[PDB]
Symmetry: D2
Subunit: 323 residues, 4 copies
């Protein structure tokens, strides 16, 4: 998985969901008066509306990622072997990983607001159900001002500022930023010949600025490539051009089927790619086998309802036969 | 640019068109009785029908790439500094680069037929017009059996068998092939710890078998990653699944605006990406700002006509507003 | 700087000293009755004998690295921007970094003995003199059983077990070990063609198993190359063949004059390379401009002396003229 | 193998010889009246004196490399699968590769005379004996002005100007030179942060300008590292500092025992490193097991004699015991 933010005119949030098997992913709009019950903290009976993609195997919205009506987005990504969830701790706000996105997005308008709520957080090892045990995750949260990473590990809980607005998988976010130092030389422009002024070296290609940028599908490589591609993307003139650019950023680190064998010829691939406009509350998406962008507008729903609004995902190729 | 062939059940041919300014790219079908006049060789009043994308110019189909009704595909890719076109040479079939796609596709049903035709070729330095001078190019040709590469350089004209079915830009195809030798260790599977049996190294990420795959936008790196992506790709035989995978291959090496500055913030990008089904004579494309796949099927035209049939490209996002 | 341990039959400890200026380096034997007066802990009037290279600018052994008569080694290596030395701390053994090698090598026979001593350590910010401010360092220690790394950073004092017997410069040892994870595929053997079984790739060179191994003079690169070369070294068990292999390992990551510009054409270079036989108390060294190995044997001295025994370093080429 | 030239007042020529077995290497001086009989060309009864290292497996001087008394150097380096020797061709000068160093060095004082002598060369597939079959080789020749590469391949005989003064093993020299274009950005100085101006990247280590330089033992990687290390080396004009720098260039790309397994745990290693002063006729060398530089001065012999003068190689460490 790779989550990013991107600023064009509006502000965007979204991610590649990379895995070897799809359950029943659905787009779910959680309206304001859908009651959020939490196992160990106060229930939010009235809360901010939420749109995200979720696992369609429960009556509760099990969001992989989501934005709320106030322009704050949040995404969980695999953090296998690194995630550690705790026992209940008296004095702390005890929240399960499965409840975590509803907990933040339900009551925070901004990243700064989330940073305060996170001050007494303790992420507790409580499964949604016996059938559906907790996944190991870390989180990126973002609004139009900034983003942060939330990592609960053996050492404890850390909340980092994200100066690049990108997150992938392992390892800890401090290592991911540090590894960027190794790439200071990369550029969008043709480099000078610094190798030696004794020989003429020929600029035989465009794009030599970037040689060194890694192209594999590992978590660190994808973080570096995604970061370089996002930081150096142009902004665009319209909504349609902007989400174009955004999906180009996500394509840069997507996982094509056949390339990432995780087991007995079992293939991890980008099952969906999401792009969310934080100002407009629109959840755009593509899937592996539908390249057309689909838009689900949370503001077209009645956000005062008390029941989830659940749309299946458009999964088959949607082709424009033009002649 | 990057051009590839791919086989699922059918055989597919297509390219990324990578340049810093879009002109008037249009899908153009050349029917069988559109007379081809050649400046220095014998005319073809009747020939195979062709579909491809061209520069949108009334008087002649100036193709960047195309396929014919017999399942032969051909594309010109940039080859700046390496391309060399020749004086008229007596006893040769003297053919300009701008005429080269119509010359081969017009009378060749297979790559083998192209091989025999190319024995007598001399590519000559004649512009289409004073306003429209030749580009430096080389060519990938392909059918359901094989692909070849054609390079006219200062040393002369070579025809290479292309065992990987991929072409990008500079240098010569022999170097490009050789360089793959350096990537023998890349894998779709997790590598063993060969580094030392005295220490334990942790598999902290998925996709570590690809580490060392270049991810930059230069010509050689794009060649390596397209090749690795194409050769290790998997897909169902169904059409939608197959073109989906093909477009993911092209996505793996596309150029995002902002990342390749070719001189004072003029950015090279993947203006369009094509995929052609050689068996069904269908030209599918995406554009930088339209992610939906568009199909133009040469068989729905009247291929006995003698005028160009030109379609504007669908260039803005065609989005499914699903709610 | 790079420091390594190595086992053949005997156990060896040594380092490359990589810097832009020489501080009158000398081989110094500190005999047993040379009184150590520490600024904040108790004096050691009788201690283990020590042999190392030191800065010959005081009648005090200002060691860069050394071993003692009981086969324990210690080396200080640049750690600039990461090292943090502390205020005097109550209930701790407050040792200055300039006293640190004497403190440990004077009273410990083994790494395990050093580990106990290190539990109570606080490295204090006390300069040898107003004319010689403290250097930012971190330390490798080693005996015939194991090696450890000591880092005093802003977060505090950490002692690591060192599973590879190598250390370089920045960053912290945890990153350095984690980064090895990236090189799991490197091999001493020709790799299989894993890229694709659809194509034949030629083994055009010996040594292809190592492709990916970094060759630059940076701290992480040098850590990776010294680790791979050390762990994959072979040699027979004789003294000369063992130390030969050891200097070959150090040679792999030495810094050639001209290649590392630290400033205004100021060149950091490997001023010396050391190899110490822990069992025999022999300090072997080469220098940039003397490729011959020189040996100083601690045990040929009167170790009951009370004054430093100082040998000049042979720093001009000692050539065998065969005719 | 790696062969280099280097200039620092005097002009130096030299090589690493890398193989997994020894053929009793000796320094051999061939005096002016030692008769060279050639199978297919005219004998040299009188010729220039030569010094070099040879396989001590026959009474004929089977030089791996050598220099003559006139300042011209020539070395044979492994070129396995690339070298191709021919049948005798009427109207050529037909020379076996075993004859080639005596043929050239016997009678040329400069690289230009070598160029003229080479114009009609045909390297013929004729063994020294039934017992010693030819080795597949290419050559570096150098004098104080320039160096050249000679490659007889399946496609023919080519002579290249060598603008870097470096040669290794496979592939052809034109690819080796072309590949340097890929490393145009490497620098001896710390690069700026081109990655992005939006974030701060720290210079946590010295030598970061070199990051990307390959450090493995393969033919292309050593060519690239030897080239960067030679071209950026800072020259001291005195003899000992000059040969000292030279031997550090060759150490940069030496092959350590255990790291290059050529099959069945048989290990390729730098058996010797040579540095020849062309002006003075001195053959300086080190071996894998002797770090001290040994020097053989051709001009101290009676070069008017007619028999070979052999200096067996020193193959124990020559340790300077200082106490």
């Amino acid at each position: 998985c790779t989550a990013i933010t991107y600023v064009s005119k509006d502000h965007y949030f979204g991610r590649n969901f990379d895995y070897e098997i799809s359950y029943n992913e659905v787009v779910t709009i959680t309206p304001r008066n859908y009651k959020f019950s939490f196992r160990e903290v106060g229930n939010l009976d009235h809360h901010f509306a939420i749109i995200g993609i979720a696992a369609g195997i429960a009556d509760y919205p099990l969001y992989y990622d989501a934005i709320n009506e106030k322009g704050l987005g949040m995404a969980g990504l695999n953090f296998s072997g690194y995630a550690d969830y705790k026992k209940i701790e008296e004095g702390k706000e005890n929240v399960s990983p499965f409840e975590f996105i509803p907990w933040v997005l339900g009551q925070c308008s901004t990243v700064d607001e989330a940073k305060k709520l996170l001050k007494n957080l303790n992420l507790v090892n409580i499964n949604f159900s016996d059938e559906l045990p907790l996944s190991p995750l870390h989180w990126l949260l973002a609004d139009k001002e900034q983003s942060i990473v939330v990592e609960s590990t053996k050492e404890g809980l850390r909340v980092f500022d994200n100066p690049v607005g990108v997150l992938t998988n392992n390892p800890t976010f401090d290592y991911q930023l540090f590894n960027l130092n190794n790439y200071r030389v990369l550029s969008t422009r043709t480099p000078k010949n610094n190798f030696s002024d004794q020989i003429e070296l020929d600029i035989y290609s465009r794009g030599m600025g970037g040689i060194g940028l890694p192209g594999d599908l590992s978590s660190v490589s994808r973080f570096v490539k995604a970061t370089f591609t996002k930081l150096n993307s142009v902004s665009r003139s319209s909504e349609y051009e902007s989400i174009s650019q955004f999906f180009h950023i996500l394509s840069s680190v997507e996982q094509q089927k056949g390339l990432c064998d995780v087991g007995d010829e079992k293939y991890a691939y980008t099952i969906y790619s999401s792009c969310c406009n934080l100002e407009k509350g629109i959840y755009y998406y593509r899937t592996y086998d539908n390249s057309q962008i689909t838009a689900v507008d949370m503001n077209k729903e009645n956000l005062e309802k008390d029941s989830l609004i659940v749309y299946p995902m458009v999964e088959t190729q949607q082709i424009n036969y033009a002649n």
